[PDB]
Enzyme design. Structure first.
Site, PDB file in Angstrom:
ATOM      1  N   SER A  70       0.832  -1.198   0.000  1.00 21.63           N
ATOM      2  CA  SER A  70       0.000   0.000   0.000  1.00 21.63           C
ATOM      3  C   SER A  70       0.869   1.252   0.000  1.00 21.63           C
ATOM      4  O   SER A  70       1.735   1.414  -0.863  1.00 21.63           O
ATOM      5  CB  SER A  70      -0.937  -0.020   1.213  1.00 21.63           C
ATOM      6  OG  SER A  70      -1.666   1.188   1.348  1.00 21.63           O
ATOM      7  N   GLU A 126      -9.542  -4.059  -7.182  1.00 22.01           N
ATOM      8  CA  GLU A 126      -8.971  -2.961  -6.417  1.00 22.01           C
ATOM      9  C   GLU A 126      -9.249  -1.630  -7.099  1.00 22.01           C
ATOM     10  O   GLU A 126      -9.136  -1.513  -8.323  1.00 22.01           O
ATOM     11  CB  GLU A 126      -7.462  -3.136  -6.271  1.00 22.01           C
ATOM     12  CG  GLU A 126      -7.021  -3.730  -4.966  1.00 22.01           C
ATOM     13  CD  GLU A 126      -5.577  -3.401  -4.664  1.00 22.01           C
ATOM     14  OE1 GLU A 126      -5.295  -2.235  -4.309  1.00 22.01           O
ATOM     15  OE2 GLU A 126      -4.727  -4.308  -4.806  1.00 22.01           O
ATOM     16  N   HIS A 181      -8.431  -4.864  -2.071  1.00 27.23           N
ATOM     17  CA  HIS A 181      -7.139  -4.404  -1.585  1.00 27.23           C
ATOM     18  C   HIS A 181      -6.703  -5.164  -0.338  1.00 27.23           C
ATOM     19  O   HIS A 181      -7.512  -5.473   0.543  1.00 27.23           O
ATOM     20  CB  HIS A 181      -7.182  -2.907  -1.288  1.00 27.23           C
ATOM     21  CG  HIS A 181      -5.856  -2.342  -0.893  1.00 27.23           C
ATOM     22  ND1 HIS A 181      -4.875  -2.040  -1.812  1.00 27.23           N
ATOM     23  CD2 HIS A 181      -5.346  -2.025   0.321  1.00 27.23           C
ATOM     24  CE1 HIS A 181      -3.814  -1.568  -1.181  1.00 27.23           C
ATOM     25  NE2 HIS A 181      -4.076  -1.545   0.113  1.00 27.23           N
TER      26      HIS A 181
HETATM   27  C1  LIG Z   1      -2.142   2.005   2.348  1.00 27.21           C
HETATM   28  O1  LIG Z   1      -1.089   1.986   2.896  1.00 27.21           O
HETATM   29  O2  LIG Z   1      -2.505   2.850   1.282  1.00 27.21           O
HETATM   30  C2  LIG Z   1      -3.864   2.641   1.033  1.00 27.21           C
HETATM   31  O3  LIG Z   1      -4.522   3.883   1.078  1.00 27.21           O
HETATM   32  C3  LIG Z   1      -4.412   1.704   2.098  1.00 27.21           C
HETATM   33  C4  LIG Z   1      -3.369   1.126   2.674  1.00 27.21           C
HETATM   34  C5  LIG Z   1      -3.339  -0.257   3.323  1.00 27.21           C
END
Ligand SMILES: *[C@@]1(=O)O[C]([O])[C]=C1[C]
Length: 321
Positions: free
Chosen positions: A161, A263, A294
């Site tokens: 992420s 996603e 996600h």
């Molecule tokens: C991140 O680190 O970025 C996204 O917005 C959600 C997570 C997990």
């Protein structure tokens, strides 16, 4: 409202995390009367002024058979949430060390909006510098009670992420030659649902919300973590914005991009990978897990999709080692 100065202190407490006194061990179940394995871990400070800690993980079985490769894992949390001690991330790192037979480094980084970007990228570089300092000073021998054999020539960065964005930033800083940390050699980067942004929306970003992630929440993250007055086209969010460093000049290491087919960020991630492939001399693999949202790899450990991500990352490391 005085309750606003209060929710402020809630996020801080929520993500502050705790520090282990001494080293600890845990039992982790293997892929398929469950087969198990022990993993040793402990916390260490890597930046005294900011009181920033990271967690070291060593799979005990593999450490007694060969020099371990290093995996530097950057947790997610939209640049605003998370700690290496959060069970959600601690569990993933246990699975990483055990399944990959690798020493895992899981650092904290400063969170927004108290520490807006690029505070987090700055901390990630401090992590790699701390690793260099440990590599050239026999500090690894003092990591755990016993000795530890680590192969700093086989370092891999795994970013989840917002951590995936962090990984991209490091890949650019290294590929451009701006920083060099011999004998630490980062052989590849894995971006899991990388938190990339942009003023214009993609198709997937315009689609329906996920179980937890929505476009509103993503926008909310960006405008809490980006510097005031910056748009989502800032290079810290968009890897191909108007001021984004021309990735054609810099030589990016082998990149592995993994995202869920369902996603919101799928399109931006796919666009990113294919823009790199059509750039010359760029080994970039893109893997889309159909019908997954996600963070499936960490939200659902021991699920079939999570185990496949583990296998793919390991095959990725083997091909580059
Ligand atoms: C991140 O680190 O970025 C996204 O917005 C959600 C997570 C997990």
């Amino acid at each position: 409202p005085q309750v606003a100065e209060d929710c402020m202190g809630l996020l801080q407490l929520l993500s502050n995390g705790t520090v282990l006194r001494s080293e600890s061990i845990d039992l982790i179940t293997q892929q398929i009367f469950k087969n198990n394995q022990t993993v040793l871990f402990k916390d260490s400070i890597y930046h005294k002024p900011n009181n920033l800690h990271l967690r070291l993980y060593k799979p005990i079985s593999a450490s007694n058979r060969t020099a371990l490769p290093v995996v530097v894992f950057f947790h997610g949390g939209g640049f605003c949430f998370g700690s290496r001690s959060w069970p959600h991330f601690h569990n993933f790192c246990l699975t990483l060390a055990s399944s990959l037979n690798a020493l895992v480094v899981s650092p904290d980084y400063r969170l927004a909006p108290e520490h807006r970007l690029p505070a987090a990228f700055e901390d990630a570089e401090a992590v790699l510098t701390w690793l260099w300092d440990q590599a050239v000073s026999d500090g690894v021998n003092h990591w755990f009670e016993d000795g530890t054999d680590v192969d700093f020539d086989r370092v891999f960065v795994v970013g989840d992420s917002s951590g995936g964005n962090i990984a991209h930033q490091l890949a650019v800083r290294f590929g451009s030659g701006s920083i060099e940390l011999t004998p630490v050699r980062v052989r590849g980067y894995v971006l899991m649902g990388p938190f990339f942004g942009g003023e214009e929306r993609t198709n997937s970003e315009n689609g329906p919300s996920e179980a937890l992630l929505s476009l509103d929440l993503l926008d909310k993250f960006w405008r809490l973590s980006l510097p005031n007055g910056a748009t989502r086209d800032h290079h810290m969010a968009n890897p191909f914005g108007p001021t984004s460093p021309t990735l054609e000049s810099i030589s990016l290491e082998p990149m592995l991009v993994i995202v869920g087919g369902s996603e919101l960020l799928r399109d931006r991630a796919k666009e990113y990978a294919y823009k790199l492939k059509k750039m010359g001399g760029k080994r970039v693999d893109y893997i889309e897990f159909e019908n997954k949202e996600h963070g499936f790899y960490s939200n659902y450990p021991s699920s079939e999709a999570a185990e496949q991500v583990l296998r793919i990352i390991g095959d990725f490391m083997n091909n580059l080692s």
